[PDB]
């Protein structure tokens, strides 16, 4: 709480030590659900796809290439202008745009298509600058492309990100391509590169320039796949053919290297299935840490009065040392006034030969691997207690609150005697604990279980007058 400088300032000159020790008075007194980790901050988390995209941007910028937004929607005539005759084939893997005619139903296609790869737009862009700006021109762009590859999903998606670039100089060669691929891929952890001529020999690439780049990443050696040797095809590139360049009045050769993001991303953040990486939401991949699930386990009924706390608090203090004495027996826990009149708290076990508290009064709730267990701190369960996140809430701890807050109900009810007992524990409920319905449905969905059980056997009587 807000204190007074002087007080402590002067109170210090007298006896420092006792002044220091006094400090503890400013610290707040926290109720159950106001304690860690039932309380904590949060923070946004980014998507591996996008993250990688940004990483790609800086990568490209880190090597001279300036950013550009290339045309996305274009007329198929462009694709035709680029692939000479082989263009008919290409237009099959591409989509077209169809609109709905204004009824004064049935969609009407148009010559408009979405670019399959970045290269379709490059020529459009380069046409306006290849002859005006000073050479060498280095441009790059990381945007969306659309492709109808068989029109499936099991293999690939309809929309992907291309991390493309183009180099424009008087003299170029398959070498400049290799050069860029390296500089780019190195910044991502790749260490060794191998280039092999692409067989499909696409017509838009000067015959025999089209290459396929293979890179070595240590993060892949020993991978649960064929990429075990560490290598993978990561990018392709070539030099545009004078044919296509001419279609747009571009006088100089052009080197174009383009890499698929989704793949890099999977490699970078360790995903096996593209779809499960980019669309985790849909493919049920939602996840919460043990710590998070912990924070979600809260007390249901907590003493409202400041007295109730110090009451249930004691209720526990007793059963901690007297959970042995054979019953019938009794121990006074608390004595004081609340709201208006004195009260006494009792803890016993009316049953014959046995123990005051059940063998599970001191079991702690802890989370681990997605499960909410209820277990005694025994060398047996250790691991769970040293790799999971313990709630810090024990059976008694959780019960006592129900008790204390219960006499509180009678206090303002005019009563004079309350019987709050508890035998078995078949869930969190029986222990004055809960979790939001959404986290329940969570654990359920994640096929996780909640083994919160055990014989508590603990009764508490209180009398107000």
Partner RNA sequence: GCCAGGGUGGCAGAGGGGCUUUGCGGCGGACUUCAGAUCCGCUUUACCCCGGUUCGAAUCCGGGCCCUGGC
359's contact among RNA, a second copy, none, with CB below 5 to 8 A by partner kind, is RNA
Distance CA 211, CA 205 (A): 10
69's contact among a second copy, RNA, none, with CB below 5 to 8 A by partner kind, is a second copy
The correct pick among 373, 399, 402, 442 for binding RNA (CB under 7 A) is: 373
Q: Which part of the chain contacts RNA (CB under 7 A), choosing from 51-59, 152-160, 301-309, 337-345?
A: 152-160
Known binding residues for substrate = 117-119, 162-164, 204-205, 256
- Complex with a second copy: residue 186 or 322, whichever CB lies closer: 186
Write out the two tokens for 465.
């007058």
Residue from 197, 206, 232, 180 nearest 62 by CA: 180
- Complex with RNA: residue 255 or 431, whichever CB lies closer: 431
Distance CA 143, CA 376 (A): 55
Which residues in the 340-359 window bind RNA by CB under 7 A? 351, 354-355, 358-359
- Complex with a second copy: residue 111 or 342, whichever CB lies closer: 111
Interface with RNA, residue 426, by CB under 7 A: yes
Q: What is the dihedral of CA 262, 264, 270, 275, to 10 degrees?
A: 10
Give least dist CB 113 to a second copy, A.
8
172's contact among RNA, a second copy, none, with CB below 5 to 8 A by partner kind, is a second copy
Residue from 67, 184, 81 nearest 123 by CA: 81
CA atoms within 13 A on the CB side of 97: 11
Which residues in the 428-447 window bind RNA by CB under 7 A? 444
Interface with RNA, residue 370, by CB under 7 A: no
The correct pick among 140, 346, 401, 457 for binding RNA (CB under 7 A) is: 457
Q: What is the CA radius of gyration of the chain?
A: 35
Which residues in the 29-48 window bind RNA by CB under 7 A? none
Write out the two tokens for 85.
């005759």
The correct pick among 68, 214, 453, 463 for binding RNA (CB under 7 A) is: 453
Interface with RNA, residue 376, by CB under 7 A: yes
193's contact among RNA, a second copy, none, with CB below 5 to 8 A by partner kind, is a second copy
Taking a C-beta distance cutoff of 8 angstroms, is the pair 97, 110 a contact?
Answer: yes
Q: Which part of the chain contacts RNA (CB under 7 A), choosing from 114-122, 170-178, 235-243, 449-457?
A: 449-457
321's contact among RNA, a second copy, none, with CB below 5 to 8 A by partner kind, is none
249's contact among RNA, a second copy, none, with CB below 5 to 8 A by partner kind, is a second copy
- Complex with RNA: residue 45 or 226, whichever CB lies closer: 226
Number of residues that bind RNA (CB under 7 A): 26
Distance CA 54, CA 264 (A): 12
Residue from 214, 220, 180, 216 nearest 198 by CA: 214
Give least dist CB 434 to RNA, A.
13
Residue from 301, 299, 324 nearest 420 by CA: 301
Distance CA 389, CA 123 (A): 57
Interface with RNA, residue 324, by CB under 7 A: no
Interface with RNA, residue 363, by CB under 7 A: yes
Q: How far is CA 258 from CA 84, 148, 216, 449, in A?
A: 21, 19, 18, 47
Angle at the Cα of 378 (from 377 to 380), degrees rounded to 5?
Answer: 130
Give least dist CB 83 to a second copy, A.
9
Beta sheet of 211-216, edge-to-edge order = 66-67, 137-146, 159-168, 255-260, 231-239, 211-216, 192-197
32's contact among RNA, a second copy, none, with CB below 5 to 8 A by partner kind, is none
**Sign of dihedral through CA atoms 395, 401, 407, 410?**
negative
- Complex with a second copy: residue 46 or 465, whichever CB lies closer: 46
Interface with RNA, residue 253, by CB under 7 A: no
DSSP string of 353-400, one letter each residue: SS-SS-TTTTEEEEEETTEEEEEE--TTTHHHHTTSEEEEEEHHHHHH
Angle at the Cα of 92 (from 88 to 98), degrees rounded to 5?
Answer: 110
- Complex with a second copy: residue 332 or 412, whichever CB lies closer: 412
414's contact among a second copy, RNA, none, with CB below 5 to 8 A by partner kind, is none
- Site string (110-149) toward RNA, x via CB under 7 A: ----------------------------------------
Residue from 30, 43, 37, 40 nearest 297 by CA: 37
Distance CA 193, CA 217 (A): 9
The correct pick among 20, 424, 436, 441 for binding RNA (CB under 7 A) is: 424
Write out the two tokens for 171.
């003299």
Known binding residues = 117-119, 162-164, 204-205, 256
Give least dist CB 288 to a second copy, A.
7
Q: Which residues bind RNA (CB under 7 A)?
A: 150, 152, 154-155, 351, 354-355, 358-360, 363, 373-376, 423-424, 426, 444, 449, 451-455, 457
């Amino acid at each position: 709480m807000k204190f007074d400088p002087q007080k402590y300032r002067e109170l210090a000159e007298k006896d420092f030590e006792a002044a220091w020790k006094a400090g503890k008075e400013i610290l707040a007194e926290r109720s159950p659900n106001e304690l860690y980790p039932r309380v904590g901050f949060s923070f946004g988390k980014e998507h591996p796809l996008f993250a990688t995209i940004q990483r790609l941007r800086e990568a490209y910028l880190s090597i001279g290439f300036s950013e550009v937004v290339n045309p996305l929607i274009v007329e198929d005539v462009h694709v035709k202008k680029q692939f000479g005759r082989e263009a008919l084939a290409v237009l099959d893997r591409c989509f077209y745009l169809a609109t709905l005619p204004k009824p004064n139903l049935k969609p009407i296609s148009s010559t408009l298509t979405l670019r399959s790869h970045m290269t379709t737009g490059w020529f459009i862009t380069l046409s306006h600058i290849a002859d005006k700006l000073p050479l060498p021109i280095k441009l790059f762009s990381i945007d969306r492309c659309f492709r109808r590859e068989q029109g499936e999903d099991a293999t690939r998606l309809y929309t992907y990100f291309s991390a493309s670039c183009v180099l424009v100089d008087e003299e170029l060669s398959v070498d400049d391509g290799k050069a860029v691929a390296e500089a780019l891929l190195r910044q991502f952890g790749f260490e060794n590169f191998r280039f092999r001529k692409d067989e499909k020999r696409s017509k838009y690439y000067i015959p025999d320039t089209q290459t396929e780049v293979f890179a070595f990443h240590p993060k892949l050696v020993g991978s649960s796949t064929k990429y075990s040797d560490g290598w993978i095809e990561i990018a392709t590139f070539g030099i545009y053919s004078p044919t296509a360049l001419a279609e747009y009045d571009i006088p100089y050769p052009v080197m174009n290297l383009g890499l698929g993001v989704e793949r890099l991303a999977m490699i970078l953040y360790g995903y096996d299935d593209v779809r499960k990486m980019v669309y985790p939401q849909i493919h049920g991949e939602i996840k919460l840490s043990d710590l998070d699930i912990a924070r979600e386990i809260k007390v249901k009924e907590v003493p409202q009065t400041a007295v109730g706390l110090k009451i249930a608090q004691s209720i526990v203090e007793t059963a901690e040392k007297h959970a042995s004495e054979p019953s019938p027996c009794s121990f006074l826990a608390f004595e004081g006034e609340m709201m208006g009149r004195n009260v006494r708290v009792y803890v016993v076990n009316e049953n014959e030969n046995t123990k005051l508290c059940g063998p599970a009064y001191a079991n702690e709730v802890v989370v681990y691997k997605g499960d909410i267990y209820g277990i005694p701190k025994t060398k047996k369960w250790r691991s769970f207690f040293e790799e999971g996140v313990p709630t810090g809430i024990r059976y008694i701890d959780g019960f006592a609150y129900y008790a204390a807050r219960k006499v509180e109900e009678a206090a303002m009810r005019e009563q004079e005697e309350v019987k709050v007992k508890a035998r078995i524990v078949e869930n969190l409920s029986d222990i004055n604990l809960y979790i939001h319905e959404n986290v329940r449905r969570y654990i359920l969905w994640k096929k996780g279980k909640i083994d919160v059980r055990g014989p508590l056997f603990v009764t508490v009587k209180a009398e107000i007058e």
